[PDB]
Ligand SMILES: [Zn+2]
Ligand SMILES: [Zn+2]
């Protein structure tokens with residue numbers, strides 16, 4: 778694959794139509810906190826309750842990876858691998 782790293786800052790990627798928005802019940806500050814497919818690292822959430830949503834004209838947002846205020850635990854952005 779190919780994915781731009783966002784080292785030293787937040788991701789902030791705006792989801793595109795069709796793309797998944799990952800939430801983790803355990804890691805997320807709250808239910809608005811999401812991760813894009815570039816960033817979500819399955820290894821961070823092996824023992825966690827995760828769910829995906831699908832971006833539509835009406836379900837939108839930006840990825841919170843590397844926004845320290847949005848997560849209860851250190852994430853290891855997938856792009857860094
Ligand atoms: Zn992201
Ligand atoms: Zn990331």
Ligand SMILES: [Zn+2]
Pocket residue numbers: 801802803804805821822825826
């Ligand atoms: Zn998690």
